[PDB]
């Protein structure tokens, strides 16, 4: 019965990690940020409404130019929008309409999408022909594609419902690295600003820190009570925020290896579909099932604002790299740019 | 707006048009979510109608059906079952020759999957076309193996008719919220050749009753 002895050692190691986290827990982030001036009530207003999706929008991603954004809808369309002019730049017909993630390449030359087809499809936005075409179909995940994020034009990291994340060489189409260790469906990804490591939240109510080059889970963060649907790094890359089904957002520090705040209101019971940070990181914008985005003071756990204006579940949201705008997509087939 | 801005707006309007015709074309398709236990006979159901998820397309009496098979999605279903929220109907396949089998009992697994899908929060009004497959093999096994193995409280004849009716009732009583949805149970084995007709009848019935409910007549 060597299983018991190994399980005993694993339990002892878990206790050691818990004690190490508790020893560093000298002062919660709330205690330190009592003296900081609380930004009372930000009033973000819908600047644009992106209409043209005919089903539930499941994912959006901003371009690095902070003007172009891709959106994924179950109508089988990957639409690229000019958010300034509201114009649609591209409407990409998806081979599988069951898309639930979309990424935009940091170069802007590619978008990725995927979902229940278990394929991460890479689309060449900039062809000699005037059409967007599938440049690559990344097969190898055995569950649905829940998130994808480009490292560059040739590296993309994908999370899946097969409980694993994968690093793909797009030119070869092969899984360069597989990130195993999650026991539940991995729902969200967030690349660190340096893209040398990323966090993934899964349905085992845990967020894991993965080194892209090493392929190892450097840290595991367990503070949520239900499935983690959303994850987002802090702008400096030393912390990340999660969004779970327990109506709670949490901020986990990488270096402290511990959770720093819980962003939960007793009047909120719906799960979080998407989290994102403003450019400075002081605001944590979270999309919810109660149809609206809540803006949180990331440093004080204060509900600084509400982005109400969607008639269905806010499935996705991202802040532009310049931080000028937040676009929230929702199940009511509408994308709204706020500011 | 500059000349290039005007031409970009024109391109966006052409994209809007194409999205409009694509949505109009997609609205004329009856969406079906196909469920079951994989070994339940949904494969021969697909064959009669004709990795990731499989979309099977067929037309019957001028209705075009899009039937989505999600059996290959071995991941947690709560995270993607809402994708099929607006589905016209659910086609649930259950092998009748699974009462005496085990993976727990196969028919108990089918029963709990059916209960979860039927009473799912996303399918409160979506009717279920319940296919009870392997009726001939169910005959050949009910002749020898009693149904009391799966249902200890059966207390009934071990003949095909009574046993099959009992299984159908056991599946249909898992249907809570019986006001908002209906179960269209069909008995097939592998050569019924009326399964597409049954699905057409069930879907047209669902459409007609939805239209009646709109008008306050159901």
């Amino acid at each position, epitope marked *: 019965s060597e299983l018991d002895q190994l399980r005993q050692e694993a339990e002892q190691l878990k206790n050691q990690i818990r004690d190490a986290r508790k020893a560093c827990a000298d002062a919660t982030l709330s205690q330190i940020t009592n003296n900081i001036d609380p930004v009372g009530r930000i009033q973000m207003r819908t600047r644009r409404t992106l209409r043209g999706h005919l089903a539930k929008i499941y994912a959006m991603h901003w371009g690095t130019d902070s*003007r*172009l954004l891709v959106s994924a809808s179950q109508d089988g369309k990957l639409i690229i929008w*000019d958010s300034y*002019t509201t*114009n649609k*730049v*591209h409407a990409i017909p998806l081979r599988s309409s069951w898309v639930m993630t979309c990424a935009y390449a940091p170069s*802007g030359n590619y978008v990725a999408c995927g979902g229940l087809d278990n394929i991460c499809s890479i689309y060449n936005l*900039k062809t*000699r*022909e*005037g*059409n967007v075409r599938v440049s690559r179909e990344l097969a190898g995940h055995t569950g649905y594609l829940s998130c994808c994020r480009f490292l560059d034009d040739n590296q993309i990291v994908t999370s899946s419902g097969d409980t694993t994340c994968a690093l793909w060489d797009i030119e070869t189409g092969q899984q360069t690295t597989t990130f195993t260790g999650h026991t539940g469906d991995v729902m969200s990804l967030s690349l660190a600003p340096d893209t040398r490591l990323f966090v993934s939240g899964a349905c085992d109510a845990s967020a894991k820190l993965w080194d892209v080059r090493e392929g190892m889970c450097r840290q595991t963060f367990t503070g949520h009570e239900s499935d983690i649907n959303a994850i987002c790094f802090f702008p400096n890359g030393n912390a990340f925020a999660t969004g779970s089904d327990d109506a709670t957002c949490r901020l986990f520090d990488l270096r402290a290896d511990q959770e720093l705040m819980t962003y939960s209101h007793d009047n909120i019971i719906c799960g979080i579909t998407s989290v994102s940070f403003s450019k400075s990181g002081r605001l944590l914008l979270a999309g919810y099932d109660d149809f609206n985005c809540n803006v949180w003071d990331a440093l004080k756990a204060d509900r600084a604002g509400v982005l109400a204006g969607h008639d269905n579940r806010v499935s996705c949201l991202g802040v532009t790299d310049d931080g000028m705008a937040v676009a929230t997509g929702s199940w009511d087939s509408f994308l709204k740019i706020w500011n | *707006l*500059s*000349a*290039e*801005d*005007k*031409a*970009a707006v*024109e*391109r*966006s309007k*052409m994209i809007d048009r194409n999205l409009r015709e694509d949505g109009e074309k997609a609205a004329k398709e009856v969406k079906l979510l196909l469920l079951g236990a994989g070994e339940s006979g949904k494969n021969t159901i697909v064959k009669q109608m004709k990795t990731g998820i499989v979309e099977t397309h067929f037309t019957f009496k001028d209705l075009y059906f899009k039937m989505f098979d999600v059996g290959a999605q071995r991941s947690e279903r709560k995270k993607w079952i809402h994708c099929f929220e607006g589905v016209t109907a659910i086609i649930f396949c259950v092998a009748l020759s699974d009462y005496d089998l085990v993976l727990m009992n196969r028919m108990h697994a089918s029963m709990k999957l059916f209960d979860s899908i039927c009473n799912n929060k996303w399918f409160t009004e979506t009717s279920i076309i319940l296919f009870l497959n392997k009726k001939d093999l169910f005959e050949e096994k009910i002749k020898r193996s009693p149904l009391t193995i799966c249902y200890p409280e059966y207390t009934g004849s071990n003949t095909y008719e009574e046993a099959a009716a009992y299984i159908q009732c056991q599946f249909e009583d898992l249907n809570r919220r019986k006001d908002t949805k209906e179960i269209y149970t069909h008995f097939t084995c592998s050569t019924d050749t009326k399964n597409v007709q049954f699905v057409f009848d069930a879907v047209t019935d669902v459409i007609i009753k939805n239209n009646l409910k709109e008008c306050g007549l159901y």
Partner: single-chain antibody
Amino acid sequence: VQLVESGGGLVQPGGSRKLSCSASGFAFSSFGMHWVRQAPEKGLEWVAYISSGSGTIYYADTVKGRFTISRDDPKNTLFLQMTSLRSEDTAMYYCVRSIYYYGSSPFDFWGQGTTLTVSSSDIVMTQATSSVPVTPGESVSISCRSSKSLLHSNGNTYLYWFLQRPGQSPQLLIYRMSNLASGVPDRFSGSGSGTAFTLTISRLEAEDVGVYYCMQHLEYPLTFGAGTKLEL
């Protein structure tokens, strides 16, 4: 990607011709197509524009009413119906594909062209300098003057640079001023502001020899500069 022009030839004045553009290798229906003509010894002159989906059409004031532009999207063909051909229509007619979305590269590909030898408020691009003498490996700057500020209130400056290499169709170098076109070496650079622009070549070669044309894309009389030739 190729555009092949059909038609042209000797025409008695007052006649009628149809120019045909057999487009292949690209999504023709999504590109707004242009006709840009060039007289046998003079510079480029934009003739007609038909947008993607045919919903928007423009003609040069020298051909409006007199010319008709049309496209056959199923057949991937662009047409220029010409009636009452004056001697001023004696030019090589180029079909130019141009696509318009955010960040697109209009005028990126040009057809080979067919010569048409007819028998016997517009913004003014000015290239006063012409036929510069250059030595390979040495930098050169080509100036461009505009009669109006090409910089739109949206932030874009709609100046285009083309290279008419000897015996070859024009080739887009820089599309929206300081925007290098795909396939162009990163030694051409675009610069300027408002009405004055420069196209600088970092270290030219023998392949850089040709005529360099401006173009405004701010309104739709599309006007070119009297191209500045380069010669060794």
